[PDB]
Design a protein around this ligand. Structure first.
Ligand SMILES: [Cl-]
Ligand SMILES: [Cl-]
Lengths: 449, 449, 158
């Protein structure tokens, strides 16, 4: 038997006298606990708001609120997806409730010294949708764990080792490049940025090959970013690599008819007697040059050569994900990512995917007039203009390295990848796993078309 | 006879040997001067780039480059709009060339102590288009003059006087509110913000009533902003009011079948023994309250009551224009404005209008999750969260004051209203008149539908 | 005369413009050696133990944080009755060290001295001129010069 049962209630739905006396008015995520009818167990009444305004995000948030209110129970049954009357179809309700339950239960206690809850059950006939939601949420929590991991544990070599182990679990193809084998690939930005650190850099390629469409995902894996010699105005700057790895791990379970390759440059950015210097010039894999005008804009320099490699003459589409710029957050706020692409059809695909996933993105323009801020007196471009517009300038910088004719999108997720404000809804303090579920929904949509 | 004739040349078009020897390759805006065939005058060869890639902006920029290269000539004939072969229709070429000529000739020398050019002629059969372009550019230059004017000359009372004089020129209806007559309107934000200054505030309503659609335009007219007691991290913070006034002055010439009302709060924000204090609460015209948490976010507080008045139970649509937030510029850069509206159809109308005008805007989202950053411990809202996302938060703040059911758009033009980098194309250093031409094109489109 | 003076100026411009990753102290010493060879200016490059022997304590202390080792170069034009010594600061990259700045152009003095010396054989001045060129990077590092450290100089002062 369930120790606790969570009942979804839209505004106007009947609850008992005790629930009314406690102030239950079905506000989204409001929870009031009471004894079960027979007095042997617990019932949670959980608000879903007005039936007419409810979305999948309402259900996701209500499930997370339910799991947070479980107390010392061993078993919890969520009946939330059985609540009908909203416009959210049964399968969408089931998927969202399953996701919210896993996301809301997430804890990162690995590094504390010194959970009665053994089973969460989602009630619904939509078993496929439950499975899909659990898998998406489990992938999100993998990314959360990677971001939360101290940089001393998750070094570039350790991260490469972890990716290899994850790949083995579905027999994703995995190649790890290190030392002389890495030098051979000509990823000059990665090796230049990574050299100051005592930890050597790594490059990992991770392939799902279950198709007619091949998608390349590029994820920024800076495991610790101190700003280098220039300083910042630090373990979470591998959030892009975390999102890409996690999305790839979810694909074998979903069984999408789509080939997907992950490209993952891993490094630390540290000050040191041998660190990358202001004024240095990097000669990239495509023969073009970048002048290092600020060592804290290292991400774009690392990604450059990987985008050349990923788009070389073959992937039909390349998507990069990176915690790239701080300028983004000033106008967009802390919970919204930035999307760049020249392809309007790809923009709509990514944006609709983010809406299904409950993740907030804003498309920003690849402004031609900001290219003047890439100009260098010495090299082909700079990595920092010291002027306003760095979020757009970084996107334009990356665009230079994507081979002619290859559709491309760039996701700048610096702010929403790490929550330094309190927990809310299904999102914890700290590493969030932001963009995992957007990526999965994007890949699902691309596989259909 | 013309002392100078400017000839438009697309890439591949024939020029003489001298022009080739000087390096003329028809780059957009490249100018090479040479003797006329008879040796009595001057010819400018002016680049228009590849015929296939040329836009109206190409023509606007080429015309501005031509006028800058005139030397001591008394008369200039631009033949640029006669260049065909691009996809830009003849009327669009003529309008753009006329605009670029006026915009490129602009100078603000009123305050220097101690122009042989008497006539600029645009050659084309499209005389209506030339007239339209000259009028749009003349309105833009009016806004440039107002922004460039020292704050000691353009005080709130002086600005109100200037608007009255401008209105008289077409018999636009004009009402100026001051002193006790101003107090009666209940524009509490304007009177609170304006009180520290020795200059009293003004409120001006300016109406074009030549229609079935009535549009309200609200323009922020802070003639000098010191930041108040809180300080800034200053004469150009009336760029929104300048744009609105200038757009209104252009309507009688164009003769649009559309009623348009301008609403213009004018004030200085100064530190003083009687200045607005951090912690003060403003009770607005709609009965709601705002807590002043930072005196440098005064614009939104001034606009609040005017939006109540402008949308009160009647205008079919309200558009506000304001140099509102500095956060905008960090990710968008210095040459792009921010557009906010909940109405997708209105967004497309404004964006297409800006494209016709050659002005850069980016639509940003009214993010529901940023409303939590409007919360106050004392009042209904704050004017500053001290958190990231202020550009979005300011838009949400303003949205609160627009009456239910009234379509609304907000243009945040803080960065592109004043060019503190060098002149380029048709844009000078200093006051730019940004958004005048977007507003005119928006009103044209609305009048058709 | 004008072409030669301007060509020397442009040599200095090239050295200053060169990225610090290319123009390291060892690379700069190599370039000076090659320039000297072109007129047979006498050139001595001091490195490692040979450098330590000269007792240029300030140079070795400042230069130690960097992965790049310091160099000291003496470059002599000896075509005279007057002998002039030119000393040029050759910090090829200055990060500020551990204290930080409030960076490749801090070898402009060494560049000017080297370039002036290269112009003398063409002009044929009846004057002996010696260049003295300490070359190093100033970097933060676990082994970098510390605030509070004391340098004992070649003259015994601190
Ligand atoms: Cl970067
Ligand atoms: Cl404001």
């Amino acid at each position: 038997a369930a120790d606790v049962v969570a009942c979804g209630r839209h505004t106007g739905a009947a609850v008992g006298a005790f629930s009314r006396r406690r102030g239950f008015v079905a506000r989204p995520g409001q929870v009031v606990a009471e004894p079960s009818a027979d007095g042997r167990a617990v019932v949670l009444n959980v608000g879903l708001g007005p039936a007419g305004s409810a979305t999948a995000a309402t259900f996701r948030a209500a499930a997370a609120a339910s799991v947070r209110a479980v107390g010392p129970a061993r078993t919890l049954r969520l009946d939330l997806a059985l609540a009908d009357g909203s416009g959210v179809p049964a399968a969408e309700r089931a998927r969202a409730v399953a996701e919210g339950a896993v996301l809301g239960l997430y804890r990162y206690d690995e590094y504390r010294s010194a959970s009665p809850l053994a089973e969460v059950i989602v009630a619904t006939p939509e078993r496929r949708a439950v499975a899909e939601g659990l898998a998406a949420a489990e992938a999100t929590c993998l990314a959360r764990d990677l971001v939360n991991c101290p940089a001393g544990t998750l070094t570039p070599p350790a991260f490469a080792d972890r990716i290899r182990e994850l790949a083995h679990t579905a027999g994703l193809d995995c190649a790890v490049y290190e030392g002389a084998g890495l030098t051979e690939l000509g990823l000059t930005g990665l090796t230049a940025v990574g050299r100051g650190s005592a930890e050597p850099p790594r490059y990992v390629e991770l392939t799902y090959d279950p198709p007619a469409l091949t998608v390349g995902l590029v994820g920024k894996g800076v495991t610790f970013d101190s700003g280098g010699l220039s300083l910042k105005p630090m373990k979470a700057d591998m959030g892009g690599a975390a999102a890409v790895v996690a999305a790839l791990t979810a694909l074998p379970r979903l069984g999408l008819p789509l080939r997907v390759r992950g490209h993952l440059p891993l490094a630390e950015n540290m000050p040191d007697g041998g660190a990358l210097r202001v004024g240095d010039v990097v000669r990239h894999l495509d023969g073009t040059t970048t002048e290092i005008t600020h060592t804290d804009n290292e991400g774009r320099v690392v990604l450059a050569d990987v985008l050349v490699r990923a788009s070389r003459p073959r992937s039909d589409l390349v998507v990069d994900v990176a915690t790239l710029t701080s300028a983004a957050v000033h106008a967009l706020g802390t919970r919204t990512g930035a999307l760049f692409t020249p392809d309007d059809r790809l923009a709509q695909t990514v944006l609709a995917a983010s809406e299904r996933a409950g993740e907030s993105f804003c498309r920003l323009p690849l402004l031609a007039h900001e290219r003047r801020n890439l100009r260098s007196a010495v090299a082909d471009r700079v990595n920092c203009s010291h002027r306003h517009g760095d979020t757009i300038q970084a996107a334009l910088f990356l665009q230079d390295f994507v081979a002619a004719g290859v559709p491309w999108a760039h996701l700048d997720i610096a702010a929403p990848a790490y929550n330094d404000e309190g927990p809310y809804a299904e999102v914890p303090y700290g590493g969030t796993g932001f963009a995992v579920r957007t990526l999965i929904e994007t890949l699902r949509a691309l596989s259909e078309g």
